Each structure stands twice: as C-alpha cells, then as structure tokens.
C-alpha cells in the first residue's frame, strides 16, 4: 500500500511513534518519505553485501529481519522480512521502535541523516491534525 501523507501521519500517531524516544512525528513521516515514498512494499537489494531492506522505512535483513538468505544475518526485531511488507504497519512500527532503542536513535538510517536532520521537517505533519 502507498499511504497518503496525512493517512500515514495519523497512522503513525495511533501507533505511539510522536515522540517514541524523542522523535517527532514529523521525522518519522521524513524518514518514510525519503526511504520508501511511504510504500509498503518498497524493496530494494543490496548486490554488495547481499542484503535487502523491506517495506515503508526500508529495514535492512542483515540485522533487523529475518529473510533466510542473507548470510551471517541476525534478526533483532524478531520478525520475518515479509512482516514488512504488509498494508498494516503495525510490525513495521514496532521494529523501527526497536531499531531507534540502539544508541543511533533515528540516525541509524543514513537517507534520514540525509534529507531530514537539520532539515525544516515541519510540512510533512501540517493540516493532518496530529
């Protein structure tokens, strides 16, 4: 599924993520935008190191997800890959809240660091009523 802006900031609220470990909404929304044009689907394989990130935050399979083909993985989230690339964004959410407990925080998705921090991230929440 291919949320609409305002759908999936509401969507995000409901789920606990406005301000899950000190991040905004408004960063959350940033970081679906940029890493998956907030699709669900969204998939794209790592040639280099063999791994894939799934869904709406792009959610690598080396660490956090288990796809069975990605050699020397782990799966911190303890979660199928496929878990990821559902409509309902509930396992999605739960673990980018995992992957945001590590010392990183947000930062550990290089597009967010990118295209959201120290970024006017404000318009991605306005008029959604959150």
């Not at 979660?79 to 964004?89: V, Y």
């Given at each position: 599924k291919i949320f609409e802006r305002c759908e999936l900031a509401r969507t995000l609220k409901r789920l606990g993520?406005?301000?899950?470990?000190?991040?905004?909404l408004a960063n959350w929304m940033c970081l679906a935008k940029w890493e998956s044009?907030?699709?669900?689907?969204a998939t794209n394989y790592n040639?280099?190191?063999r791994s894939t990130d799934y869904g709406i935050f792009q959610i690598?399979?080396?660490?956090?997800?288990?796809?069975?083909?990605?050699?020397?993985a782990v799966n911190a989230c303890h979660?199928?890959?496929?878990?990821?690339?559902?409509?309902?964004?509930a396992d999605a959410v739960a673990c980018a809240k995992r992957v945001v407990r590590d010392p990183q925080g947000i930062r550990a998705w290089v597009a967010w660091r990118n295209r959201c921090q120290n970024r006017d991230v404000r318009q991605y929440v306005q008029g959604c009523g959150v």
């Open positions: 993520m406005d301000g899950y470990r000190g991040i905004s044009g907030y699709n669900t689907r040639a280099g190191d690598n399979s080396r660490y956090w997800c288990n796809d069975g083909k990605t050699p020397g979660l199928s890959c496929s878990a990821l690339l559902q409509d309902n964004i």
